[PDB]
């Protein structure tokens, strides 16, 4: 699904997901897929943990522009939506029944 179905790789960065084996392996696969396609903005980190300083990030995403969630989640959601609209991520008509 990472290699053939994924269009955007959202990563949740926290004190728990930093240095976790499954997360790191999935990040490596996502990096290989990003090189495979012509898309530099394929991996998007989302920082949520106040105890995870911006200087203690793993080497795989130290150079990426992340979306901030610590001070509030509403503006983080708005930032994600604006980024997706700017990058033309595929989507259908809005429907809250699927989430329900």
């Amino acid at each position: 699904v990472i290699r053939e179905d994924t269009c955007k790789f959202l990563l949740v960065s926290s004190s728990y997901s930093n240095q976790r084996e499954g997360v790191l392996k999935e990040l490596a696969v996502a990096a290989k897929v990003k090189k495979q396609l012509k898309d530099d903005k394929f991996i998007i980190p989302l920082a949520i943990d106040e105890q995870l300083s911006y200087d203690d990030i793993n080497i795989d995403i130290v150079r990426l522009n992340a979306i901030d969630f610590k001070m509030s989640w509403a503006r983080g959601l708005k930032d994600i939506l604006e980024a997706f609209e700017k990058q033309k991520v595929p989507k259908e008509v809005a429907d809250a029944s699927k989430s329900n």
Partner: protein, 469 residues
């Protein structure tokens, strides 16, 4: 062997026409009905109270967690939930010097010092409302603990003002009624609980594991008091009106002179929900009697019917009068002498003083919530408190008590009455809980009656609930 019946959950409605059984989950998933833009708050209190309120506002802009996410849903932040701004920058401060507070709380008379303190606060609130430019949605009144300790009616101290209740909260809310200012009262030990401790180094009230629950409750109350609609009932049928009647003792004079207040609920016909107090307090002079004289009963029912007709355009097809007492023949004869011909009037009594407890034979968890036992075609027990499998816990701690519902007058179906009573337990806007144990028609009417019994000068009071709760 006796046979029990089960009643399904009623479900409530949220944004985008989505239904849920919980208010916390539906608010975190979907959001509220209407679109506020932002809460502009007025804060009247001391300096440290203002700082405490600012810190609390800064605290609830972020996620707040409980100890267990299954038993208690977490709080994802005020703007994430309610899609509106409530931040500590749109705040206006009205300082109250501590010397005045110390001065007035010493007169050795509860009535006089309570009157002085209520006057002190409401003078500043009224002056700010009348002669200023800033617009305020809700007024947050921060109260020290020393004021809260000594202002109860049965509080010991270690004529003109005697025609008022000796309670700060009720007198404060009644004396601000003719100005129609929504206000929320906070203790100083509620917003900053970590700082107030007993003589062991530990907080007097420990909110460590229930911080998210407190945030949910406070945010919902602030959102509702500022003109927001958090949710509504999803299966209210057309042509049915629910009327709750509650009695209080006026006292504070020669005559106990019992008083009666009402609460009304029905369907807007625009698929909304009309839920407002119906009160011009009706009086009975004879002591100990909780029945209306024919004139007062006629006036009450006529007013309720006229309100329903004006809102809808037609008379109701069904009127349920919920009450905590029985009706006599004079009361119901007076009721029936004004009811229209093609309207069914049913009077139901909901009682709590009836001993009956069901125990599960094996487990340490109580009976399932929506169980009911039908004694007869006109009586039934109903468990509104009990185990809820959705949250993996019950709404009580010991074995819960059921409500004894009796169709006192009229002709109805007890199963539908039980269904409506269970549905009405999902409208406590003064809280953010899974479900209530009593219908809200009998609770908000009680609140209104206890508010407009602390003063005698109130005439044609407002009916919106945001001026009492």
């Amino acid at each position: 062997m006796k046979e029990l019946i089960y009643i399904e959950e009623p479900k409530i409605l949220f944004a985008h026409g989505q239904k849920c059984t919980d208010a916390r989950d539906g608010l975190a998933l979907f959001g509220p009905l209407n679109n506020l833009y932002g809460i502009k708050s007025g804060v009247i209190g001391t300096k440290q109270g203002l700082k405490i309120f600012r810190d609390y506002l800064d605290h609830i802009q972020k996620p707040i967690y409980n100890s267990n996410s299954i038993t208690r849903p977490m709080f994802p932040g005020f703007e994430a939930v309610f899609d509106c701004k409530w931040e500590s920058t749109g705040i206006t401060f009205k300082e109250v010097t501590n010397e005045d507070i110390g001065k007035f709380l010493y007169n050795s008379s509860t009535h006089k010092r309570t009157y002085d303190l209520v006057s002190l606060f409401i003078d500043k609130i009224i002056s700010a409302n009348k002669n200023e430019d800033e617009n305020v949605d809700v007024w947050f009144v921060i109260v020290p603990d020393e004021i809260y300790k000594y202002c109860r009616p049965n509080s010991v101290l270690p004529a003109e003002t005697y025609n008022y209740d000796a309670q700060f909260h009720d007198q404060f809310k009644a004396r601000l009624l003719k100005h129609t200012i929504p206000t929320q009262i906070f203790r100083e030990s509620t917003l900053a609980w970590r700082d107030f401790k007993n003589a062991f180094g530990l907080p007097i009230r420990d909110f460590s594991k229930i911080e998210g629950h407190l945030a949910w409750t406070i945010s919902t109350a602030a959102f509702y008091k500022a003109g927001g609609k958090p949710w509504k009932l999803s299966d209210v049928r057309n042509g049915v009106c629910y009327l709750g009647l509650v009695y209080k003792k006026v006292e504070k004079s020669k005559n106990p002179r019992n008083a009666c207040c009402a609460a009304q609920m029905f369907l807007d016909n625009g698929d909304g929900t009309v839920f407002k107090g119906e009160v011009g307090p009706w009086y009975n002079p004879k002591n100990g009697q909780y029945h209306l004289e024919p004139k007062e009963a006629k006036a009450l029912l006529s007013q309720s019917l006229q309100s329903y007709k004006e809102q809808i355009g037609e008379y109701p097809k069904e009127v349920f009068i919920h009450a905590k007492t029985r009706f006599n023949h004079q009361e119901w004869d007076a009721f029936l002498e004004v009811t229209p011909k093609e309207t069914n009037l049913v009077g139901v009594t909901i009682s709590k003083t009836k001993p009956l407890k069901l125990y599960k034979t094996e487990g340490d968890y109580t009976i399932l919530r929506g169980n009911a036992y039908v004694v007869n075609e006109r009586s039934a027990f109903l468990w509104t408190v009990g185990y809820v499998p959705k949250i993996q816990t019950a709404l009580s701690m010991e074995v819960p008590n059921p409500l004894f519902i009796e169709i006192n007058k009229g002709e109805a179906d007890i199963k539908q009455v039980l269904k409506d009573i269970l549905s009405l337990t999902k409208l406590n806007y003064n809280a953010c809980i899974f479900a209530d144990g009593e219908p809200v028609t009998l609770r908000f009417a009680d609140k209104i009656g206890e508010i407009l019994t602390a003063s005698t000068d109130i005439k044609t009071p407002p009916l919106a609930f945001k001026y009492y709760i």
